[PDB]
Each structure stands twice: as structure tokens, then as C-alpha cells.
Design a protein around this ligand. Structure first.
Ligand SMILES: C[C@H]1O[C@H](O[C@H]2[C@H](O)[C@@H](O)[C@H](O[C@@H]3[C@@H](O)[C@@H](O)[C@H](O)O[C@@H]3CO)O[C@@H]2CO)[C@H](O)[C@@H](O)[C@@H]1N[C@H]1C=C(CO)[C@@H](O)[C@H](O)[C@H]1O
Ligand SMILES: O=C([O-])C(=O)[O-]
Length: 780
């Protein structure tokens, strides 16, 4: 039995006193409220909030039975007796507490009938997790395939079809019960930790996500090389093998930006060496030369690191001496069994552990390491009696990886203020994206089921802050011989998801350069396509940094009034314009694509489809996966390069998909130096915009550039604009008012400025795009 007793509005927070204690409400923005119970006691701080001490001006009004605490769009309605808080956007109820807070920590909310609930981070349970319950406890799930209620990277957060996001801002071992035990009840539980939740509202799914990342953090733009081709396996055994692999990419003519060194870089065996955090010189004898030699070829080196320092490693004594490891209640360094051996865990929550760990990253970075891979941050093994500076293992568990990323991010920015950190990790918390965390979906099995689960996982993570979620392409775990068709399908999908990193246990090759001739013939032009599409991908990355908009978007974005679309985990949007349907079973001969109503084109074949709702049936082939382009799309390309270090935008090729059903369309291309972490903030970029206006007798393109530019920016770009499904009735082109004839023959065989290819229904315009506004008008 809880009831209101009194409140105090100071400042700018609402502090309510019930018969059970104090509750603090603070708006972190016009659309987001933090609600802290047991406010009067000392608790762990928020981890989810980027600005935890924020509190914007809200209006408070009181009635006999209620208080109202209202921000711009979100309003908290506080019922006095019994005590219950409910949340409104406009006049629409978003979410209501049932019993609300109870004591070990428990939050209970009503769920609406028919309300669909995404969230929980990585689970393989279906997109709508309502009817499910599962732990909040980051944990490895080795060799998972088509089901999981608990894996590496959980998030204590949900997204509702009511268009709100609820965050349980708690780092402890806990649980989420989404109307499983009781049909109309959402229950959040934790053994300890902070007793707070955060509700974020939005008027659309993109707006919801923009509002959510506003308060939890926006991902800094990754270096452009993060979007390129990675060579990886578990693992290169020597410097010779590593150099041979870089060489294999060169001789096989596959693009390569980065090679990733797994745990053999610091030891001869899988077990016993973890914590050495230094080169195994027997097998990597000249690592500085190795990294310098790779940089000469435009190739970065990334090294794996882990939280665990084994008692058998060379750094045990020093870590103990430095007080860098978590302790037992008795006060000694805590040592325990984990897969890799016997050892302790670096206390990243302590000053000592942070300084000790950070100095190691600095030293290796100075030697030439370009980026960092932090594995096992669940932490994979984390005994209950382990004590960190700010709480026991069960209390801080779900934030360990989060803090580890913060430490490393801060360390990298302090060391290299003019470069963007690359940090790939397996586990984090809400908001970890603000430290640049790039997560991958762990040790997936080498099975079709493992591949088939990746879109669900990526969408679930993307919706809640993580634009660069991706998988070990081709699959990681076990297997005894390559499943060739599966591998190909996985690396094809790979082109259209955030990070192109094939990786697997090395008894089967994960790199595409080690595959048979047929596989390479299929994948080589696709890996090159990935590079040619850098302007499209890097622009989506830019938008993610701006607004939180994920690179992969769910089908349900296409119709917010059709909740049934939420269930779809088989087709997704890659950027604004591509609808991608991965093939996830062997021998599939055709696919049914639930394309949104409108006009769509086969990405590979240029075929035009129109639909008023019925799905489209496309045949499959082994060399592609089915991809449709939305009418009105501007698809920008540059020539393929071997490494993003060689990237040029002097030559642009842009494909516009024309249809009268799209009378107005817009595109943009974000260009900067690919490396400056301050480029966006300082406007040191070249933002290209294209606008198409398509009427009965005219098709008009307006081109412009903004931004202050950057060193090496081309003043003038040679541009080839290819208009698909172009009318055959255009007779002339005006460029800035100067009329030019459109040739109607030999379009591919002459250096023509404007030509129409009647067999392909493509109209090609070739011109110079300088710094001034440029207008192109086609007239019938
Ligand atoms: C490569 C991974 O090694 C370790 O995984 C162990 C795992 O701990 C064992 O339990 C597992 O046995 C499983 C069983 O758990 C059972 O669930 C399943 O049905 O049978 C399996 C029998 O093989 O054995 C594996 C070792 O093969 C470790 O826990 C795990 O984190 C490791 N993966 C990470 C480490 C590396 C290597 O540095 C990275 O390459 C990888 O990307 C990373 O995720
Ligand atoms: O759309 C058009 O104008 C056409 O196809 O002729």
C-alpha cells in the first residue's frame, strides 16, 4: 500500500514523498523522463544517460487526486491514492505503472491489449517479445543458432508499438517478464543496483530513436575504414601467417582495410597466456615493422584484448602489485576458473585498474595498433563474490563492458585527439554507443539457423542505439568442413549490413580470399561493390551520428499504422532505399518479398515492379541475394579501391530510379576526410545534395554542396548520372539554362554528354559538378 504524502519542486526536479519514501522525477529532455525511486538513499549512478545530471524546465500542476509533471511532449501523470505514475504523449497514454516500485528491486507496469513489445537486446525469440520472460545478465551463448533467451549483449530496455522506449537504468543481475507470468503485466526485476527507469516518447519511430539517442548518447562517426573489408580468423598464428594473409588479399585482388589479430598475438596457446597483453615474440618477432609494412599498403592492425589476467600470465604479479584486479571480500585479488585458465578480472571501475589497463593500451597504440577488439566483456565469467570498486559482481555485471569501452574511448581520444577510435566489443549497456562501441553477435554456429537469426539480432540492437551491430560473416563456431552455399549467402548478406568482418575458427577459412574459384568469382565483385557503395554507406553512418537512425531499418518503419509488420525478421532496409531479403536456407529457388506499396526495382536486373500491397515473387540465383530499390532512390557510387586509404570522390556515378509516382525525391552524399573526429561539429565536410522533381513533361535535378570542405576535397567532380526507367520522350536537356541535345544511340560507345539507351530505358548525363549550384532539366 503506497500513497502520496507531499512533494517539493526544486530544482528543476520533482521530489515526491510517499509513505514508502522519496521519488525524484527529472526530464532529461522534452521527450524523456528519469524516474528514481529510493531517491533519498545512495545508489549507483545512471549508466544509460549521457548527461545524468540534466534536468530541463518542466511545468507542474496539481489537482485533488493527481499531480502533472509535463515537458514539451511527454507528461507524467501522478495519481495520489493509490500511488501510481502513468506517462502520456499528448493525451495518449503510453505506459502506466501497476504496483510500480517494490522491494529485491521490482517494477510492475500494465501492458495494453495488443501492444507489441520489442527489446531486451540480443535474444532469438521473435521480434515481438511479449509473452516472453528472460534474465538481464550478459552471458555467452556459444554456438547458438535459432533460439536464445540469454546471450552476450542484453539491454534492459524495450520499444513499444505505442512508440515509447522504456529503459531500466540498472546494471545488476535481473530479469524482464514481458506479460508472460501475467498477461497484462510488464515486470522488471534486479537483485540490487539502481532503482530507476527512463521513459522516452516519440511521434514516429525515427523520432523516438532520435529522442532516445539524444538522452542516452549518439555514436561518434567511426573512421571510414571501419566500413571496409576486414581480414579475420581465430586466429593468425604468426607474423608470417598474418603477412601472408594481407598478401593473399593483394594477389587475389580483394579489397582489404584491416587485419585483426586474435589471441595468438600474445601467446602460443589458447589457454594460459591471457593477460600477457604483449607480443609473443617467438611467433611475432618484428611487430612494429609488421604494422608499419601494413600501413604502407593502407592496411590497419587491430588486436584482441580481454578483461582477464591469468595467474599464469606475465602480468599477474604486476597487476596485483598495481591493485588493478577486482578483489574478494577478504581483500585479496580474486582468482577463478574460466575457459582460458585461472585468473582475475581487471577492475575497470577502479582508478588503479583503469590507469593500469589504459597505460597498456597507450603503449601498444604507440607501436602502431590502429584499433581495438575487446572480447569477453559480459564478463564471460564473473563470480558473485567478486568485488569491484563500486559494488559486487552481480551489482555491476551488465555495465562492465560499458565502463571498459568508456575507459578505452577516453584513453584513445586523449592519445590521438585527431583520430576516431575503433572499439569492437561483445557486451555493453544502454548508451555504450556514445563510446563508439561496435558490437558483434558473438560465437554464432556455422549453420543456416545461425545466419537466419542475424537480421532479428541486428534490428533489435539497431533500434536501441547500436547502428554497427554485425555478425561473424560465414559463421564462427565448430563445423568440420565449409558449408559453401551457406558461406556465400552469409558474405552476400554481409555487404548489406554494418561491418564487413568474416571471422571463424581457423580449421575452416573465414576469409573470402582463401575460398575456391567459384566462391571467389561470386564474392569478389560483391566485396568490390561494398567499396563502390561507400558513399551510400558512409552517408547512412553520418545520419546515424546525427539522429541515431540505424543503418539497418526494420520493415515496420514502412507503415507505422500496420503493427503486424513488426513481426518481420526476414526483409529489412539497408539505408533509405534498399529493401534486402537475405537467403537463409539452402536451395531456395524463389522468394516472396513483402515490399511496401509503391514502385520497386530489382537492384541487379533493373526490372520495374509496382505493387498496391501484394508481395512480389522474385527468383533467386547463387551470385546475388534479392535486393529491391525504392523508386526515387539516388544511389551514389565511386570507383572501387583496394583500401579506404586510397579513397577518392573525384569520380562519382549516381543512379536515380525515376517513376512518375514519386514527384519529389531527395538524396545526399556526405564527404569528409574520413578520419577527423571533429569534422561534423566543425562543419569540415562537403555535403552534396540532389533533388529530383518529376512531373508529366519534365524531370528536373537540383544539385548543391554545403559545408566548409576539408583538405583534399575535390573542387570539381566528374559526375555520371544514370536515370533508370527514364521516359523515351525527353527531347532536350538544359544545364543551368544552356540547352543540350539528347543523343538516342551509341550511348555506351561515345563520350556523350546526354544519351538515351532505348534497350535499357536509361538516360545518362555526364557533367562536371563544381561548388556552385547546378540544375539539370529534362523536357519532353
Ligand atoms: C572460441 C571460444 O572459446 C570459448 O568457448 C568455449 C565454451 O566456453 C565452452 O563451453 C564450449 O563448449 C560448448 C558448450 O558450451 C556447449 O554449450 C556446446 O553445446 O558445446 C560446446 C563444445 O564445443 O567450448 C568452447 C571452445 O570451443 C570461450 O568461452 C568463447 O568466449 C570463445 N569465443 C571468443 C574468443 C575468441 C578467441 O580469442 C574470439 O575468436 C571470438 O570471436 C570470441 O567471441
Ligand atoms: O513517366 C514518363 O514520363 C514516361 O515514362 O514516359
Amino acid at each position: 500500500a503506497v500513497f502520496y504524502k507531499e512533494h517539493k519542486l526544486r530544482n528543476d526536479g520533482l521530489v515526491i514523498t510517499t509513505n514508502q519514501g522519496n521519488i525524484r522525477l527529472q526530464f532529461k529532455s522534452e521527450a524523456a523522463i528519469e524516474v528514481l525511486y529510493r531517491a533519498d538513499s545512495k545508489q549507483l549512478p545512471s549508466f544509460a544517460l549521457a548527461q545524468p545530471e540534466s534536468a530541463i524546465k518542466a511545468q507542474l500542476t496539481e489537482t485533488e487526486n493527481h499531480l502533472q509533471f509535463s515537458g514539451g511532449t511527454l507528461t507524467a501523470r501522478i495519481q495520489k491514492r493509490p500511488f501510481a505514475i502513468s506517462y502520456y504523449r499528448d493525451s495518449e497514454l503510453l505506459l502506466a505503472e501497476e504496483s510500480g516500485f517494490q522491494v529485491k528491486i521490482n517494477f510492475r507496469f500494465y501492458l495494453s491489449p495488443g501492444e507489441k513489445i520489442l527489446g531486451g537486446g540480443q535474444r532469438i525469440l521473435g521480434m515481438d517479445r511479449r509473452g516472453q520472460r528472460f534474465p538481464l545478465y550478459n552471458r555467452a551463448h556459444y554456438g547458438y543458432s535459432d533460439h536464445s533467451g540469454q546471450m552476450y549483449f542484453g539491454l534492459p530496455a524495450i520499444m513499444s508499438s505505442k512508440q515509447y522506449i522504456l529503459v531500466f537504468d540498472n546494471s545488476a543481475s535481473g530479469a524482464m517478464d514481458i506479460g508472460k507470468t501475467e498477461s497484462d503485466i510488464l515486470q522488471l526485476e534486479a537483485k540490487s543496483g539502481r532503482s530507476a527507469y527512463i521513459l522516452v516518447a516519440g511521434n514516429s519511430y525515427p523520432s523516438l530513436i532520435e529522442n532516445f539517442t539524444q538522452v542516452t548518447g549518439r555514436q561518434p562517426l567511426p573512421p571510414r575504414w571501419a566500413l571496409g573489408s576486414f581480414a579475420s580468423r581465430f586466429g593468425y598464428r604468426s607474423e608470417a601467417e598474418t603477412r601472408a594473409t594481407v598478401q593473399k588479399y593483394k594477389t587475389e585482388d580483394f579489397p582489404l582495410d584491416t587485419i585483426v589479430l586474435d589471441l595468438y598475438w600474445f601467446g602460443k596457446d589458447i589457454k594460459g597466456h591471457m593477460g600477457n597483453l604483449d607480443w609473443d615474440k617467438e611467433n611475432f618477432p618484428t611487430p612494429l615493422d609488421m604494422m608499419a609494412d601494413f600501413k604502407q599498403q593502407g592496411v590497419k592492425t587491430v588486436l584482441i584484448t580481454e578483461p582477464f589476467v591469468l595467474t599464469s600470465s606475465k602480468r599477474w604479479d604486476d597487476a596485483v602489485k598495481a591493485k588493478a584486479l577486482a578483489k574478494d571480500p577478504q581483500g585479496q585479488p580474486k582468482a577463478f576458473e574460466l575457459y582460458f585458465g585461472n585468473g582475475g578480472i581487471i577492475d575497470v571501475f577502479s582508478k588503479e585498474g583503469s590507469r593500469w589497463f589504459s597505460s597498456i593500451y597507450k603503449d601498444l597504440s604507440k607501436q602502431g595498433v590502429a584499433g581495438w577488439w575487446g572480447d569477453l566483456g559480459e564478463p564471460e565469467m564473473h563470480p558473485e563474490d567478486t568485488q569491484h570498486a563500486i559494488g559486487d559482481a552481480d551489482t555491476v555485471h551488465n555495465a562492465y563492458g560499458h565502463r571498459w569501452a568508456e575507459m578505452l574511448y577516453q584513453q584513445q581520444l586523449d592519445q590521438f585527439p585527431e583520430l576516431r577510435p575503433f572499439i569492437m566489443m561483445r557486451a555493453g549497456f544502454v548508451g555504450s554507443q556514445r563510446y563508439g562501441m561496435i558490437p558483434w553477435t558473438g560465437d554464432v554456429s556455422r549453420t543456416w539457423g545461425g545466419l537466419a537469426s542475424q537480421v532479428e539480432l541486428a534490428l533489435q540492437m539497431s533500434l536501441l542505439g547500436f547502428g554497427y551491430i554485425h555478425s561473424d560473416l560465414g559463421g564462427f563456431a565448430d563445423g568440420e568442413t565449409l558449408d559453401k552455399e551457406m558461406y556465400i549467402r552469409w558474405l552476400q548478406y554481409g555487404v548489406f549490413q554494418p561491418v564487413y568482418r568474416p571471422h571463424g575458427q581457423d580449421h575452416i577459412p573465414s576469409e573470402p580470399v582463401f575460398q575456391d574459384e567459384e566462391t571467389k568469382a561470386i564474392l569478389r565483385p560483391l566485396v568490390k561493390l561494398r567499396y563502390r557503395m561507400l558513399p551510400y554507406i558512409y552517408t547512412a553512418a553520418y545520419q546515424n551520428t546525427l539522429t541515431g537512425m540505424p543503418l539497418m531499418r526494420p520493415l515496420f518503419f514502412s507503415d507505422e499504422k500496420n503493427p503486424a509488420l513488426i513481426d518481420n525478421k526476414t526483409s529489412y532496409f539497408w539505408g533509405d532505399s534498399l529493401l534486402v531479403t537475405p537467403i537463409t536456407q539452402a536451395g531456395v529457388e524463389s522468394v516472396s518479398i513483402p515490399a511496401p506499396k509503391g514502385v520497386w526495382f530489382d537492384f541487379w536486373k533493373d526490372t520495374r515492379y509496382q505493387t498496391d500491397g501484394a508481395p512480389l515473387t522474385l527468383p533467386t540465383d547463387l551470385h546475388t541475394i534479392p535486393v529491391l530499390v525504392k523508386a526515387g532512390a539516388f544511389m551514389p557510387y565511386v570507383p572501387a579501391v583496394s583500401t579506404t586509404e586510397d579513397y577518392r570522390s573525384d569520380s562519382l556515378e549516381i543512379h536515380y530510379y525515376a517513376d512518375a509516382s514519386v514527384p519529389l525525391a531527395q538524396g545526399e552524399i556526405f564527404e569528409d576526410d574520413g578520419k577527423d573526429p571533429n569534422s561534423i561539429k566543425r562543419n569540415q565536410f562537403d555535403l552534396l545534395t540532389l533533388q529530383a522533381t518529376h512531373t508529366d513533361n519534365q524531370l528536373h535535378f537540383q544539385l548543391a554542396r554545403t559545408g566548409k570542405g576539408y583538405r583534399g576535397m575535390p573542387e570539381r567532380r566528374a559526375t555520371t548520372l544514370v536515370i533508370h526507367n527514364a521516359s523515351d520522350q525527353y527531347q532536350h536537356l538544359d544545364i543551368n539554362g544552356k540547352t543540350i541535345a539528347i543523343a538516342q544511340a551509341d550511348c555506351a560507345s561515345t563520350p556523350a554528354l546526354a544519351c538515351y539507351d532505348q534497350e535499357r530505358r536509361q538516360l545518362q548525363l555526364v557533367f562536371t559538378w563544381g561548388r556552385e549550384a547546378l540544375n539539370l532539366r529534362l523536357h519532353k
